[PDB]
Amino acid sequence: AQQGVFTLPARINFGVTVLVNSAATQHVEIFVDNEPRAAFSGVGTGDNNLGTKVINSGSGNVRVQITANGRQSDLVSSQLVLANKLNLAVVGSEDGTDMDYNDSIVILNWPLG
Amino acid sequence: AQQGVFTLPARINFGVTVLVNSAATQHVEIFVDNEPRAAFSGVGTGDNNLGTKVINSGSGNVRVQITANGRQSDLVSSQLVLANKLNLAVVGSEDGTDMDYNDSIVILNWPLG
Amino acid sequence: AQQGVFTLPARINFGVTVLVNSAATQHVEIFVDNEPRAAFSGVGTGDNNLGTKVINSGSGNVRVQITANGRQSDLVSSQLVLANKLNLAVVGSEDGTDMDYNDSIVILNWPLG
Amino acid sequence: AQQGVFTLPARINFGVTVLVNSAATQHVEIFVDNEPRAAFSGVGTGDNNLGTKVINSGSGNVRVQITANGRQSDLVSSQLVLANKLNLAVVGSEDGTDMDYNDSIVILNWPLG
Ligand SMILES: CO[C@@H]1O[C@@H](C)[C@@H](O)[C@@H](O)[C@@H]1O
Ligand SMILES: CO[C@@H]1O[C@@H](C)[C@@H](O)[C@@H](O)[C@@H]1O
Ligand SMILES: CO[C@@H]1O[C@@H](C)[C@@H](O)[C@@H](O)[C@@H]1O
Ligand SMILES: CO[C@@H]1O[C@@H](C)[C@@H](O)[C@@H](O)[C@@H]1O
Ligand SMILES: [Ca+2]
Ligand SMILES: [Ca+2]
Ligand SMILES: [Ca+2]
Ligand SMILES: [Ca+2]
Ligand SMILES: [Ca+2]
Ligand SMILES: [Ca+2]
Ligand SMILES: [Ca+2]
Ligand SMILES: [Ca+2]
Known part of the structure; x- marks a missing residue:
């Protein structure tokens, strides 16, 4: 199945947070309506937090892509809803051979505020 | 039900990341074996990222505590496992009256590395 | 937080499946727009499957209530989305003192067909 | 990533429940330690419930296999833990071209009783 693809509410601001656990440099790209x-x-093996960015979901079509070593x-992904309100969309990723799926971890959340 | 309590593998390092979405200053404490x-x-309403800390699970008894306005x-919480390997334990929290459960969002993840 | 309350797509058919793990007789009610x-x-301790019923979500406001011993x-609950398409809304419940939360397990899923 | 593979607690009884939503006849096999x-x-398009079976996890290595049209x-899958106690392992599956991932839905749950 496709992974890292999520339908968000339209025109909503959402947060994207990235953690890294790899010796290979990670590159995460978030697409909205197929636009970068x-x-x-x-890079780093100690759950290195690359920060959070807030962007708008456009029509709602959000895709996460992760590259390393060219x-x-x-990818592996799921969406969770807590209290019928808090949405998290999670992506794990594997750049190598150990199947730990933590090399980049991408978390999308909404609504904000 | 109790929320914000998780059983982790014993003696494992795990990451804790916090995002805030509230006008009220948030205070998060992570307990391991009943010790801080x-x-x-x-404080902030823009999914503001408070960083990540790595700590050890001890016997495995981990509890998230979130305080605002004293x-x-x-709390609301769940645990997700992806690819039979990547674990996320998620806590949403509500400090007020709007039931958005995003006031602090606490994410635990393991294994690291 | 309220638990067992889910917002479904409007006017959608969804399935409800119930499993039981208790010596106490379980009674599950599904409300749609506050109507029963x-x-x-x-009853039974061996994951007794009470079957599946298909009903319509109306405006989308679905609530699960579970009673035992009067x-x-x-309740504890979450919603999961797999492959950006398959939705499961899950409720666990506790009728007693052992905190196993399996006494009734209610699973909602959509879309069907 | 591999999907439909879960590590359960060793030697635990767990329930398996299957729902179908397809014109194609579904065949589900649950492997424990690589043995059926x-x-x-x-077959059916109405979220038709195939019942529940209880089996033992052996060493803990459980795999769900779904076949249709030979x-x-x-597969797509994840595991959820509620109240730090109730475990659900969920598998959706796609036998065709519409990407609905509901053709068979397999739900594992533990602990029982
Ligand atoms: C070379 O392999 C990459 O870096 C290692 C330090 C591990 O984080 C591994 O999971 C990752 O795939
Ligand atoms: C006063 O209420 C608090 O701050 C507001 C700006 C909102 O973030 C609300 O969810 C939060 O509970
Ligand atoms: C009397 O307690 C009820 O029945 C027992 C057999 C157990 O299933 C328990 O979890 C349940 O709460
Ligand atoms: C022929 O396609 C199969 O049967 C149809 C009736 C749908 O359930 C479809 O999702 C399934 O893959
Ligand atoms: Ca890796
Ligand atoms: Ca890694
Ligand atoms: Ca709030
Ligand atoms: Ca808020
Ligand atoms: Ca119980
Ligand atoms: Ca029980
Ligand atoms: Ca299909
Ligand atoms: Ca189908």
Whole structure:
């Protein structure tokens, strides 16, 4: 199945947070309606927090892509809703051979404020 | 049900990341085996990222506590496992009256590295 | 936080499946727009499957209530989305003192077909 | 990533429940330690419930396999823990071209009783 693809409410601001756990430099790109709208990069094995960016969901079509070593990482993803209100969309990714799926972890959340 | 309490693998390092979305200053404490092991605080309505701290799970008994305006916030939580490997334990919290449950969002993840 | 309350897409058919793990007889009621629309009852400690019923979500406001021993059970719930398409809304419940939260398990899923 | 594979607590009884939503006859096999331990089959587009079977997790290595039209369906999966106690492992599957991932839905839950 496709992974890292989420339908958000239209025209909503959402946060994107990235954590890294790899020796390979990670490159995360967030697409909204197929347009490149947020980028992160970093490296480190101690859950290195690359910060949070807030962007708008456009029509709602959001996609996460992660690269390392010049190639697309393998993705795994899910969406969770807590208290019928708090949404988290989570992506884990694997750049190598150990199947730890923590090399980049991308968290989308909404609503904000 | 109790919320914000998780059983982790014993003696594992895990990351804790906090985002805030409230006018009230948030105070997060992470307990391991009933002892305080990590603190965060901050205020903001823009999904403001308080950083990540790595701590050890001890026997595995981890509890997230969130306080604002001198009162423990109402918590909601769950744990997700992706690819049979990546664990996220998520806590939303409500400090007020709007039931948005985003006032502090606390994310635990393991394994690291 | 309120638990067992979910916002579904409007006017959608969804399935409700109930499993029981208790010596106390369980009574599950599904409300749609505050109206009583599906009922299940049963007992047993071996994950006894009470079947699946398909009902319509109306405006989208769905609530799960569970009783045993004449009183409302304590609920815990979450919603999961897989492949950006398959929705499960899950309720666990506790009728007693052992905090196993399996006494009735209610699963809502959509879309069908 | 591999999907439909879960590590359960060792030697635990768990329930497996299957729902179908397809014109194609579904065949579900649950493997424990690489050995077949439970089968289900059926066909229907109405979230049709194939029942629940209880089996033992052995060493803990559980795999869900879903076949339709003689081909293994594409799987998506995750595990959820509620109240730090109730575990659900969920598998959606796609036998065709519409990407609805509901063709068989397999739900594992533990602990029982
Ligand atoms: C070389 O492998 C990459 O870096 C290592 C330090 C590990 O984080 C591993 O999971 C990752 O895939
Ligand atoms: C006063 O209420 C608090 O601050 C507001 C700006 C909102 O973030 C609200 O959710 C929060 O509970
Ligand atoms: C009397 O307690 C009820 O029945 C027992 C057999 C257990 O299933 C328990 O979890 C449940 O709360
Ligand atoms: C032929 O396609 C199969 O049957 C249809 C009735 C739908 O349930 C579809 O999702 C499924 O893949
Ligand atoms: Ca890796
Ligand atoms: Ca790694
Ligand atoms: Ca609030
Ligand atoms: Ca808020
Ligand atoms: Ca109980
Ligand atoms: Ca029970
Ligand atoms: Ca299909
Ligand atoms: Ca289908």
